[PDB]
Amino acid sequence: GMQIFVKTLTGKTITLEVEPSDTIENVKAKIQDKEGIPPDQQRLIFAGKQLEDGRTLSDYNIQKESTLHLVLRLR
């Protein structure tokens, strides 16, 4: 159990309760929970890299109290 953050483009910070092994696809399931934005349109960025779904938080070494940056892509 950890506590990470997700900053958005408007300025709000979204703190979410995750595990180090949570897949990125589930991290954005929790963001449709809180903001209603479809998970297919979300893009999380950590250390200048778009975190891909099908990988864990531990695959990109995201620790406690980390901040991710959400950007949106229609596609």
Partner: protein
């Protein structure tokens, strides 16, 4: 003009809380409508070790009109013209991808990070690079033509870094 004050606050805001991998300055001190952007390629990427340079042109309407983003470094990318100009949806004059007065430089810069991560193969500025990028992604990385061009350009930025006196982090 409100554009001048908006750009001073945004420069100060982006220098106190930098976008990671981005360093913003003024081309000439006293002109807030013309920014120097020094981008750094992140680890675990084909751009690792790079030192790329770009420039931002802000209009007097700012933020009611989008600025212009132009790489000085040559870039091989499906959404970067031969001039260096980047075709991003947000920089186009007229939802979160289109320009509004609510958008800021931090929004632009993060959008450029996303666009470097995932090219928009639907509106290619460099068709030859878009058609080269897609055979890379469909080969699942096997075809190395695209990543060879990228790595050649990334290797050459080391000369640029020495001239500007920049220690690549």
């Amino acid at each position: 003009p409100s554009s001048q004050k908006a750009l001073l606050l945004e420069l100060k805001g982006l220098q106190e809380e930098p976008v990671e991998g981005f360093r913003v300055t003024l081309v000439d001190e006293g002109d807030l409508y013309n920014w120097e952007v020094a981008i750094f390629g992140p680890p675990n990427t084909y751009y690792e070790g790079g030192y790329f340079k770009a420039r931002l042109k802000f209009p007097i309407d700012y933020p009611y009109s989008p600025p212009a983003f132009r790489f000085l470094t040559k870039m091989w990318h499906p959404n970067i013209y031969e001039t260096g100009d980047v075709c991003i949806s947000i920089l186009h004059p007229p939802p979160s991808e289109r320009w509004n007065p609510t958008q800021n430089v931090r929004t632009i810069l993060l959008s450029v990070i996303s666009l470097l991560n995932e090219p928009n193969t639907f509106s290619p500025a460099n068709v030859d690079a878009s058609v080269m990028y897609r055979k890379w992604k469909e080969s699942k990385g096997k075809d190395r033509e695209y990543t060879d061009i990228i790595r050649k350009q990334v290797l050459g930025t080391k000369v640029d870094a020495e001239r500007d006196g920049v220690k690549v982090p």
